């Protein structure tokens, strides 16, 4: 894999650096590297494909070296170099498209797409130039096991769940208490709703708690915690649990008081925030506990008093909300984001070449069912395909 990244990087740097008129003092090292790559590759025959609608291709490298005699590169040299480079680029794209599709429950880190097994030999190890990118660096590190980490902007770690929970229900659904939540991508919008506005409750206060349990630990998360969740703040017609009947939900927002956010780890508490909003930090957390309240206003104007009476009809249901969006984060494991096209490349390749469903990844690689069960085998294979996807995207975008 390191040699695959090295091929991709030196081909990128050859298409960038080697241009007409440039100075050999700037590309001597890269030309020695390219010539060594050519030498190491000359005499090998590779096969690529053999799964789904991916064709079966054969590659046979017999090229000529690049002259070390010049001082200023001319177009008659660049043209030959690019004729040589386009073949390597097609070969690398095809290898990456062979490797992003395959899976294994046993040693997923161990390569597939047997051309890559061949490249893993000891006669190909002379190709390595530099491994600086994030994914390849974390690859080499996690192999030489150390404290690694990928940086993410707006990560997709929450599987899509839009659901509610009723702690007081009736068949007519006229006096309820409960909590609603949408956990999607990087956002959690939660809303505790009481139809009585905490009149029959003790101290005119009603509690709500929402516990989210991540499958992989994060670190150094920057979070934005705002009140007044939006998508649980307008009229609604929601179905019962059992699907028998429905019920109306006409919300009226109130502030959450004595609010609390606990970022935990293995049941232990790590960070705690009380009545703070806006930007917050979490140094490490596998679990989030939001705890908020609905406090009936002791004083009330005529309108709001006529909205919160002491009888059962309760045509305006009091609510207390919280939006929480993870903006940035850092994770030892590999996930999706709103910045990087690695998952998109992988899924697009699989969908294009009609890859049968395998033992490890879910059908179609739907991130919901892929993060609701993120077992080590899935994690390893996902890291591998994301790394070769980064590689392929350094060349063909």
């Amino acid at each position: 894999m390191d040699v695959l990244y090295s091929l991709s990087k030196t081909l990128k740097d050859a298409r960038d650096k080697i241009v007409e008129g440039t100075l050999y003092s700037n590309v001597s090292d890269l030309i020695q590297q390219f010539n060594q790559m050519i030498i190491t590759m000359n005499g090998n025959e590779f096969q690529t494909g053999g799964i789904g609608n991916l064709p079966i291709r054969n590659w046979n490298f017999d090229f000529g070296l690049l002259g070390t005699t010049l001082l200023n590169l001319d177009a008659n040299y660049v043209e030959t170099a690019r004729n040589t480079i386009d073949y390597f680029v097609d070969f690398v794209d095809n290898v990456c498209m062979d490797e992003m599709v395959r899976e294994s429950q046993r040693n997923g880190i161990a390569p597939q797409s047997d051309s890559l097994r061949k490249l893993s030999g000891i006669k190909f190890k002379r190709i390595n130039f530099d491994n600086s990118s994030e994914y390849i660096e974390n690859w080499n590190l996690q192999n030489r096991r150390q404290r690694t980490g990928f940086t993410f902007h707006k990560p997709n770690i929450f599987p899509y769940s839009a659901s509610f929970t009723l702690n007081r229900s009736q068949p007519a659904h006229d006096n309820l208490m409960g909590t609603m939540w949408l956990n999607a991508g990087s956002e959690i919008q939660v809303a505790g709703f009481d139809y009585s506005c905490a009149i029959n409750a003790p101290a005119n206060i009603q509690q709500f708690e929402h516990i989210v349990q991540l499958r992989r630990v994060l670190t150094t998360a920057t979070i934005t915690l705002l009140p007044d969740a939006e998508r649980f703040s307008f009229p609604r017609v929601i179905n019962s649990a059992d699907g028998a009947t429905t019920w109306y939900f006409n919300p009226v927002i109130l502030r959450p008081n004595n609010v609390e956010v606990e970022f935990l780890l293995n049941g232990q508490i790590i960070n705690t925030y009380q009545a703070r909003f806006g930007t917050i930090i979490a140094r490490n957390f596998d679990t989030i506990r939001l705890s908020f309240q609905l406090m009936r206003p002791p004083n009330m104007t005529p309108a709001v008093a006529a909205l919160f009476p002491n009888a059962q009809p309760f045509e305006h249901h009091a609510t207390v909300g919280l939006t929480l969006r993870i903006e940035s984060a850092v994770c030892e494991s590999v996930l999706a984001d709103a910045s990087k096209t690695m998952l998109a490349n992988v899924t697009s390749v699989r969908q294009e070449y009609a890859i049968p469903v395998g033992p490890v990844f879910p059908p179609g690689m739907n991130w919901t069912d892929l993060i609701t069960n993120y077992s080590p085998s899935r994690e390893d294979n996902l890291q591998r395909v994301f790394t070769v996807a980064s590689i392929r995207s350094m060349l063909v975008k």
Partner: protein, 272 residues
């Protein structure tokens, strides 16, 4: 039950309890004698049964319980059916009577007996009222003070007591909540009970056959609400009223929902 319930918003579940009972519903109308008087027929019950049969209700599911007068009906209303409809005529001289009947049947009550002589009672919250039923209930009340004396009344002279009910069969009395009252009631002819209001009774539906909406179910004067199961009609004959009810019973039944607390025959629970 204390334990929680869960749900979702994407599913199309289709998985739900299926079971049996008495044959998938019952319905009971409460119509005034005046209706059968005007009709002057002895087959109209069967006529309405065979009509309801078009709306789905089988033969042995619809029933009619004639009641002579609102007061007579208020005297021990024994509703034991899975759906109850109450046609009720308008009379401006009976507003309080036909609002007390509504506050009694639409809402669910938990009643304890009361011994006027040996004890002096009081109300705790804004839902702990005193309901009295019988043939002629004349009630009189004397509030008391911290030192167990009277206030504008005398513990001995019943004439000094303040009158709140005169020649009423059903009375629903709300007095100041947080003081001890001394009561004088016609215990020979009426029984008084200390009742507490609970969640509503979704199994009954009142239908004011006549004039505009007047029923103030909530004793507090600030709400004056109107529930889904509180209907109005304009009438000049009774056959048209019944045909209307039958043509639009599915909406009545969509507005009514079977009970939740328990089974019972009267309009209130007894818990001593």
């Amino acid at each position: 039950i204390n334990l929680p319930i869960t749900g979702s918003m994407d599913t199309a579940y289709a998985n739900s309890t299926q079971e049996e009972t008495f044959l998938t519903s019952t319905l009971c109308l409460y119509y005034p004698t005046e209706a059968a008087t005007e009709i002057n027929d002895n087959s109209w019950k069967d006529t309405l049964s065979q009509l309801f049969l078009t709306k789905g209700w089988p033969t042995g599911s619809v029933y009619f319980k004639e009641y002579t007068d609102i007061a007579s009906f208020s005297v021990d209303p024994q509703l034991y059916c899975d759906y109850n409809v109450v046609l009720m005529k308008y009379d401006a001289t009976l507003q309080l009577d036909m609002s007390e009947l509504a506050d009694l049947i639409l809402n669910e009550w938990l009643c304890n007996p009361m011994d006027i002589t040996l004890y002096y009672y009081q109300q705790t919250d804004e839902a702990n009222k005193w309901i009295s039923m019988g043939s002629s209930c004349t009630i009189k009340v004397c509030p008391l003070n911290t030192q167990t004396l009277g206030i504008g009344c005398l513990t001995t002279d019943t004439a000094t007591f303040e009158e709140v009910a005169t020649a009423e069969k059903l009375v629903i009395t709300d007095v100041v909540d947080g003081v001890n009252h001394k009561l004088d009631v016609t215990t020979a002819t009426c029984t008084i009970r200390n009742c507490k209001k609970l969640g509503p009774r979704e199994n009954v539906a009142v239908i004011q056959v006549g004039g505009s909406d007047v029923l103030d179910i909530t004793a507090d004067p600030t709400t004056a609400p109107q529930t889904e199961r509180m209907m109005r009609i304009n009438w000049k004959k009774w056959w048209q009223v019944f045909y209307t009810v039958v043509d639009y019973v599915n909406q009545i039944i969509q507005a009514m929902s079977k009970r939740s607390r328990s089974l019972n025959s009267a309009a209130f629970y007894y818990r001593i």
